[PDB]
């Protein structure tokens, strides 16, 4: 119910993370594949999602609209399986694409951290962690994936 | 069948560890949602 960051479990194992804001649960498509979720005794049903963006929202439309300003450091609020939530600050790089630049964080956390929020200095969620690339040395870089509100 | 459990408040931490580089990478995004390096 409450706003905050949540683990997504399969009954049990943590397969991802998401954000509750304004009554809507936000995670990455690859975490749930649009399957329904349980929250206590209640059920959350998918409302909106997009495979190409790798995003899904439950119980309402996508609510997170803050954007990286292209200049400032950000914080990954990483929620790794089996570990407490922790903040890691970084200066994003960028994914240069044919459709514009996307901020990208060179931070490597396990599969089940997918959906962890990335924050600006005001604590607003500027996107979700966990859709990325592997560079030549094996290192990972995640897009700052944000939906449209 | 999957379920959610609260893990924390969404806040910036003043003390936070700072790490990671800032790469500028040429990337493509396919219709399946996979990024790849060009």
């Amino acid at each position: 119910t409450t706003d905050g960051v949540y683990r997504v479990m399969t009954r049990s194992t943590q397969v991802g993370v998401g954000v509750m804001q304004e009554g809507v649960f936000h995670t990455m498509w690859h975490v749930t594949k649009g399957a329904a979720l349980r929250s206590g005794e209640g059920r959350l049903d998918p409302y909106w999602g997009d495979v190409k963006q790798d995003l899904v929202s439950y119980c309402g439309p996508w609510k997170l609209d803050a954007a990286w300003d292209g200049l400032s450091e950000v914080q990954l609020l990483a929620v790794p399986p089996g570990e407490r939530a922790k903040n890691i600050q970084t200066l994003p790089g960028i994914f240069k694409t044919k459709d514009g630049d996307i901020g990208a964080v060179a931070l490597d956390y396990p599969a089940g951290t997918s959906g962890s929020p990335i924050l600006d200095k005001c604590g607003r969620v500027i996107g979700l962690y966990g859709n990325g690339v592997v560079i030549k040395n094996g290192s990972y870089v995640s897009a700052i994936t944000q939906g449209k509100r | 069948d999957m379920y959610i459990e609260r893990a924390g408040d969404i806040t910036w931490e003043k003390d936070a560890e700072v790490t990671g580089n800032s790469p500028r990478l040429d990337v493509a995004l396919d219709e399946s949602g996979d990024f790849s390096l060009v």
Partner: peptide, 6 residues
């Protein structure tokens, strides 16, 4: 990463 890039 570790389900590949996810």
């Amino acid at each position: 990463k570790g389900x590949x890039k996810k």
